Amino acid sequence: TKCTLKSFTVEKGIYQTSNFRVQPTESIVRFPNITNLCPFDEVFNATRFASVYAWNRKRISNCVADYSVLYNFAPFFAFKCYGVSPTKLNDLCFTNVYADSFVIRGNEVSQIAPGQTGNIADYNYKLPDDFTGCVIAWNSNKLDSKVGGNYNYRYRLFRKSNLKPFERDISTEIYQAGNKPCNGVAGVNCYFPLQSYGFRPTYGVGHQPYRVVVLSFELLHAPATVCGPKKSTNLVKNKCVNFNFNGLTGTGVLTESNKKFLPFQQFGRDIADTTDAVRDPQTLEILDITPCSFGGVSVITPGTNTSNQVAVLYQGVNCTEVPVAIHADQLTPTWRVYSTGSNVFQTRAGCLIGAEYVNSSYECDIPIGAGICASYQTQSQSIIAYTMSLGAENSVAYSNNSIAIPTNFTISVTTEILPVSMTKTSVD
Amino acid sequence: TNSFTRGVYYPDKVFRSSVLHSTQDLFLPFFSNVTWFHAISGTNGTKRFDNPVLPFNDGVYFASTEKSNIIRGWIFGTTLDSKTQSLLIVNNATNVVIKVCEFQFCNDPFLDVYYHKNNKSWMESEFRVYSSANNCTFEYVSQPFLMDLEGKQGNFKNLREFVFKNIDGYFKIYSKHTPINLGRDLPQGFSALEPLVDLPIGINITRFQTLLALHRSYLTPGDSSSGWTAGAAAYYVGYLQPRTFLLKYNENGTITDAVDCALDPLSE
Amino acid sequence: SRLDPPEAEVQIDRLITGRLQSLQTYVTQQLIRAAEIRASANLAATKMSECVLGQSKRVDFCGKGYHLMSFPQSAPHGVVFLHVTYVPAQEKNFTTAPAICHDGKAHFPREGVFVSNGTHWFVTQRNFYEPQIITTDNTFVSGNCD
Amino acid sequence: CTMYICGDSTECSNLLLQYGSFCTQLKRALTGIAVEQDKNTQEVFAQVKQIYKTPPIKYFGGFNFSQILPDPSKPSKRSPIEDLLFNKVTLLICAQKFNGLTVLPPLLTDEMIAQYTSALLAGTITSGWTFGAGPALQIPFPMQMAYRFNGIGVTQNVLYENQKLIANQFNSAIGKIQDSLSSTPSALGKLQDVVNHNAQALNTLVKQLSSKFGAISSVLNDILSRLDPPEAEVQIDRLITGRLQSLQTYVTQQLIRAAEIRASANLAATKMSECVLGQSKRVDFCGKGYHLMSFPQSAPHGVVFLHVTYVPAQEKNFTTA
Amino acid sequence: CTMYICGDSTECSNLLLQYGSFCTQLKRALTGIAVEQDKNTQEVFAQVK
Amino acid sequence: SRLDPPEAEVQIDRLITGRLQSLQTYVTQQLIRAAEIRASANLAATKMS
């Protein structure tokens, strides 16, 4: 209290300081049984990938893509992933991956970003702005090259219009360079759109071919497919854990769900932004993830001027269950010497710890809530939590023919305090 | 006919109960009329084929009524040939054949003898539409989505409702079978469509056609006057539009209701 | 001095927004705080114009009990009132009646209430026991006493 | 903030103290409102030092007060009028507690409030206005009304000559109040709005977490597991500003809302001290017409008054001089 | 907001809805003020039936 | 019409926050201004009554 209030002498009253939060017991990682190694590692072993005019999409099926295996083969050149972090690509689950075979000029290998709009983008392949994915590459100049010139790298130099992202077709047409019907073959005022690099193995890296694997993926509603050999763990139904269900990082109390998912429905949500329900990847179980029991804590103190004993109030908790039964290092706030405290008194705003409730009512000084107040006095001075006294009980004998008329008075002078003007301020 | 309330599905694959969530996805507008394309399919003499091409205006709501297996499949793609991939679908006897491989021309069942359905009630000699191509995209054979409930003494109409839509190349099939008796085309009520099939194949889809096998003619009349008429219908085709639909679920999780947000100012 | 000018603004503008929005909150918080003072300031003026500048018939407005006077006192950032109030005490309960019948006609007290100490009936003011002999000028007649 | 702004993440919480004391102010500002609500109930109700009880025999000169006096039969010691008021004010809830949003119960329980209301009713009925100026003094109710008629401009002989008729008028008029609130659906419009605005304000605050605020996704744990540490904060801090400013907007909106309530809370205390604790000479302050005396009634998040007024009727015009 | 914040641009409006409901609140808050002004005149003047 | 789409929001979002915050400031300033008027409106209602 004197830390949050930033002083040494706190005044008599209640003060909100922090919150009581339990901590997870263990960690649970649950993944679908299937872990078949993924066949996209065979793409690394391949030599010839493609010619960039009808680029394919090697969809990686339901398997496990130990990304570290691909990183154990050979060093990578670009490795520029403007999406998911290409370091912790292990403990998150991918619905589907769409890496495509690709190779382009070494002057244009650094232009893999979706901003270099030109021959590579408007005619070969365009990447959308709202896109997530990685780019990897390695050396491919010496493995595949021609002394005269690699004609196999022919591509679509020019086409009818701008090549939209995620469109695959062959521009089988002849460009109209003038007043000439290009349905027929011609060389004047009608040129065929085509270009071949003609690479050679005896020049600098700026003119050497590099094989590029454009990793394209998206995080979908679909069940997880390719997220590694990571160990599935056990399941708990009463204890808060740090679950990693299908890459969904989170924590809270996991319990059986009575909510009726449809035979297809997978993820459950409340009227909120967090995932309330979840479907177990194994045994098709439906879980009911809820945040671990917690509540704010406030301290009732009579002031350092008078004494040093304090009474803590755990707000809004049925405290016979959660804070009394705390194991070792169950909470990060700790100060667990008050696991049972002096006495416990249940209150609608959470119980009180460190104060004994008395059966005699008084006018109260420190409010708590729900008609319960606290004060520091004798039962030998302790903190009590009596119900506040509404006032001295009184009764007047109303009767048909009884009048009460005063015979004396008292000129009493009271006082009244009223603010009038606050201190003027001006800033610059 | 008018699509009064049908044409609503589950927009996302996320469960939620007693929520009034809004949605920006593609939907069939309420109270919009749809075309019939009532085909006789007589199979008599020279040529009885009345399944035209459909523009596929950003997804199609396809409804159909039959006895057991009158409807067979659908064809997508622009060129309608082997030049571009065709998203051909076959509702097999106990399977589904959803193949993208190119076909020169989809085959047809033999236009048999004039004695078409005297006593030839047997089931064989089908279309065999799959024209062999060296270049093929892999098929996605799975469980058949045609489940039929046997109704007796009439008063049964197993209406099959589907929604086919293309978004960012991904091509989705949503389906439902509703075994309610209808006194008129597109009956009143509410039935949400569950998501069934996804497809990660990206190609232009600006044309559409329907596969129907009616070698044995079973109560199929015809007409020769376009307009807003009434009568028996084989199927209905509607075009989806970009809308801002609002949805209301149930305690159990079923989508109980939906309301448009660009149709009626009261709805707005 | 440390970081170059062409790229320092992306850290300066990040710092200026938090610094300015912090100043924005203080200006707003003063407006509500000044509005609350205005409610108290007008209340003090209302009390000054009634409790001090006169005698207020409002109950529990210029102090507990029947209000008599008030004394303003200058205070830092406010004013202090000294309400002088009239509070009855040393009360006694008697036997009463709504009217008096003498010659078949009901008599009602012009002011005060009819009070009997046990033998003789008196009429006295409400807030002070000053019994008086019931004469015809202390009461009025309205109809018969039936 | 440690719960609402950051999903109990030590990476996000470090960026929160990175912003300074924008959250100590918000906690302090809301704490001032919380102590203000408990203060507001004090002036409205806690106007009596003692708690009064009505006598067992309740012949109030022919006036019937069964609708406003508490009934001991019910476990909830409330009047029939208060029972109707409590039923017509409908007060999800669990989803707010999981996002750091809390609701603190008021210091005075609704049952304790009805004891102040009963004490105020007993003082007005048996003792009149005297229990607000000093010790309560015995005075019969038929003669209490006679000195309230004397306070509007009619001599006390009017009441006694029509005591039975006036009691029937008062008994019938108070019986219409119970049916009047039942018939009108918008009778408790002002009270229902107070609980409606609070529920909507918290509902909007919870729904604001979906605002991605220029980040990849609204879920904070998504970035920490998907996006690398040394560059994720430029999306976290972009998300924390919108999240914090949305929280700051709610706190500000409560300050104006609390200020408006304080205007009404002081007005209720002002009305309590004159309309109930006495007879007010002000016109149209304690109801339409010549005000006679008033009744406080406990209500959820407010108070309900029953102004008993004197209204002339059945007039005839004469020639004067 | 669709007019003051964005110049009826579908690119800007997509970013505006991406911020959530900072604009439903302002429309609602100003609507509450508009009702108050019509109400404030009622008590001042509409005192006679 | 001048700057490319895939990083136009880098400047648009910077402009939308200041534009929106200014609108939010006006909404807040009206709330205090309307509250002061309501205090005066009720005072006029009291004086009228």
Ligand SMILES: *[C@@H]1O[C@H](CO)[C@@H](O[C@@H]2O[C@H](CO)[C@@H](O)[C@H](O)[C@H]2NC(C)=O)[C@H](O)[C@H]1NC(C)=O
């Ligand atoms: C007259 O007043 C006296 C005291 O002022 C009454 O005596 C007591 O009054 C209190 C009032 O709460 C009661 O609780 C006690 O039981 C009374 N004691 C006795 C012995 O009576 C007295 O009752 C009053 N009498 C009348 C006729 O008003």
Ligand SMILES: *[C@@H]1O[C@H](CO)[C@@H](O[C@@H]2O[C@H](CO)[C@@H](O)[C@H](O)[C@H]2NC(C)=O)[C@H](O)[C@H]1NC(C)=O
């Ligand atoms: C006070 O007056 C009433 C009637 O003026 C007396 O009679 C009581 O009236 C009530 C209501 O009608 C009944 O419930 C009671 O049973 C009546 N009492 C008796 C004894 O009959 C009442 O008695 C008077 N009070 C006293 C103390 O005498």
Ligand SMILES: *[C@@H]1O[C@H](CO)[C@@H](O[C@@H]2O[C@H](CO)[C@@H](O)[C@H](O)[C@H]2NC(C)=O)[C@H](O)[C@H]1NC(C)=O
């Ligand atoms: C009325 O009250 C006053 C004061 O409250 C009483 O005056 C007191 O009388 C006693 C009797 O000798 C003195 O000892 C005190 O010193 C007096 N007080 C003061 C302040 O002077 C007075 O007696 C009371 N009268 C009645 C009838 O109750």
Ligand SMILES: *[C@@H]1O[C@H](CO)[C@@H](O[C@@H]2O[C@H](CO)[C@@H](O)[C@H](O)[C@H]2NC(C)=O)[C@H](O)[C@H]1NC(C)=O
């Ligand atoms: C949700 O579905 C369940 C069944 O899956 C419904 O529960 C049945 O409700 C009917 C209604 O009369 C009862 O006759 C059955 O006995 C119930 N069965 C069971 C197992 O509970 C439930 O009503 C549905 N919820 C709705 C409609 O809101």
Ligand SMILES: *[C@@H]1O[C@H](CO)[C@@H](O[C@@H]2O[C@H](CO)[C@@H](O)[C@H](O)[C@H]2NC(C)=O)[C@H](O)[C@H]1NC(C)=O
């Ligand atoms: C005061 O009014 C109440 C009305 O609530 C009266 O209670 C009624 O009593 C009659 C006769 O016993 C019943 O027929 C009604 O049903 C009661 N109304 C209810 C329960 O709402 C009460 O009797 C009146 N007081 C006196 C002394 O007569």
Ligand SMILES: *[C@@H]1O[C@H](CO)[C@@H](O)[C@H](O)[C@H]1NC(C)=O
């Ligand atoms: C699809 O069609 C559009 C226009 O009809 C065209 O611009 C685009 O290049 C086509 N895409 C493919 C892959 O053919």
Ligand SMILES: *[C@@H]1O[C@H](CO)[C@@H](O)[C@H](O)[C@H]1NC(C)=O
């Ligand atoms: C996966 O393993 C769990 C272990 O109990 C088993 O229950 C489940 O049936 C398995 N699923 C498949 C598809 O093998």
Ligand SMILES: *[C@@H]1O[C@H](CO)[C@@H](O)[C@H](O)[C@H]1NC(C)=O
């Ligand atoms: C305790 O409080 C009293 C007055 O409240 C003050 O005079 C005294 O100095 C205080 N003692 C300490 C140790 O602060």
Ligand SMILES: *[C@@H]1O[C@H](CO)[C@@H](O)[C@H](O)[C@H]1NC(C)=O
């Ligand atoms: C609180 O916990 C006790 C266990 O001692 C249980 O009996 C009681 O029902 C619980 N009450 C609530 C409201 O959770």
Ligand SMILES: *[C@@H]1O[C@H](CO)[C@@H](O)[C@H](O)[C@H]1NC(C)=O
């Ligand atoms: C409170 O209860 C205890 C035990 O039931 C009893 O001894 C004590 O007298 C009670 N006190 C009051 C004021 O009721």
Ligand SMILES: *[C@@H]1O[C@H](CO)[C@@H](O)[C@H](O)[C@H]1NC(C)=O
């Ligand atoms: C559908 O409605 C439109 C406009 O209402 C009309 O032009 C069109 O012919 C109609 N088509 C059918 C099949 O009813």
Ligand SMILES: *[C@@H]1O[C@H](CO)[C@@H](O)[C@H](O)[C@H]1NC(C)=O
């Ligand atoms: C063949 O059948 C169709 C309908 O099934 C009918 O319209 C046609 O007339 C038939 N052919 C002949 C020659 O009658």
Ligand SMILES: *[C@@H]1O[C@H](CO)[C@@H](O)[C@H](O)[C@H]1NC(C)=O
């Ligand atoms: C359809 O079913 C038959 C046998 O039932 C089978 O031979 C054939 O391969 C199936 N076709 C497809 C496309 O699955």
Ligand SMILES: *[C@@H]1O[C@H](CO)[C@@H](O)[C@H](O)[C@H]1NC(C)=O
């Ligand atoms: C063929 O038609 C004749 C008509 O007389 C009928 O008797 C016979 O049963 C039919 N054949 C079959 C297999 O039904």
Ligand SMILES: *[C@@H]1O[C@H](CO)[C@@H](O)[C@H](O)[C@H]1NC(C)=O
């Ligand atoms: C089919 O495969 C070969 C590959 O060269 C060729 O006949 C033709 O280009 C392909 N057909 C296409 C791509 O439509």
Ligand SMILES: *[C@@H]1O[C@H](CO)[C@@H](O)[C@H](O)[C@H]1NC(C)=O
């Ligand atoms: C009542 O007052 C009169 C005044 O003259 C007195 O004579 C009488 O004794 C008093 N009664 C009692 C019981 O003292």
